[PDB]
Design a protein around this ligand. Structure first.
Ligand SMILES: NC(=O)CC[C@H](N)C(=O)O
Length: 235
């Protein structure tokens, strides 16, 4: 009757907190709208990103809505709803930096990634092994802070989150994307979705039906235009 939804609230404009601590963003909007149509009450539960899937398995939450990319490896552990939106990854660095998302360019440099994320996996496999100082952070706010402090040369995260939550904000005015999106289907998955226990067939079916329903009547686009002047859903 209650659905507990875990989210990492340091990933604007998808999941973050306003000045009085209330959860805000597109993930929150999608979650609340789906639960409205499911006719369920929903409790939001703030969590570090890397604790979300462990908390879901332990039954401390019932769903994850936290820009959780749908990947082959994660599907071995949990189930996913249908796609909520697309999520490409992209590097950011200081404006005018020559940095590229390449080993040759990042060797010896300090690159921040969120612990537990697809970006940490990609960076650990392709960069950390090979001499890039990949630094793994409990949350994304610590990454932005350490980047602006000049402790990081660059940071890898979801492209829309970096753009709307940092680059277009006053904090990130002197920073820019370094190179194009990092395209690696294996690592970064096929968009984001609601993360669910594999046996929670009924819950997944309910989320899927509300999501189709709010996409069909135009509610998705209404909510998306609050944050985005582009097609965040993808293909
Ligand atoms: N909330 C997030 O930081 C999610 C990051 C990334 N899309 C992942 O799934 O790993």
């Amino acid at each position: 009757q209650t659905v507990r939804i875990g989210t990492d609230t340091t990933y604007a404009p998808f999941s973050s907190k306003d000045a009085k601590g209330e959860f805000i963003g597109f993930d929150i909007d999608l979650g609340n709208e789906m639960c409205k149509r499911m006719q369920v009450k929903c409790t939001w539960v703030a969590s570090d990103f890397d604790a979300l899937i462990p908390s879901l398995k332990a039954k401390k939450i019932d769903a994850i809505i936290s820009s959780l990319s749908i990947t082959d490896k994660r599907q071995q552990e949990i189930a996913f709803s249908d796609k909520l939106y697309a999520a490409d990854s992209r590097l950011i660095a200081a404006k005018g930096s020559p940095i590229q998302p390449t080993l040759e360019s990042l060797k010896g440099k300090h690159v921040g990634v969120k612990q537990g994320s697809t970006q940490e996996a990609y960076a650990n496999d392709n960069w950390r092994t090979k001499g890039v100082d990949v630094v793994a952070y409990a949350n994304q706010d610590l990454i932005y802070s350490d980047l602006t402090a000049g402790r990081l040369d660059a940071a890898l995260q979801d492209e829309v989150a970096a753009s709307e939550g940092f680059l277009k904000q006053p904090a990130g005015k002197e920073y820019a994307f370094a190179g194009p999106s990092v395209k690696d289907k294996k690592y970064f998955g096929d968009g984001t979705g609601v993360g669910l226990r594999k046996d929670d067939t009924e819950l997944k079916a309910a989320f899927d039906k509300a999501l189709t329903e709010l996409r069909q009547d135009g509610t998705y686009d209404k909510m998306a235009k609050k944050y985005f002047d582009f097609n965040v859903y993808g293909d």
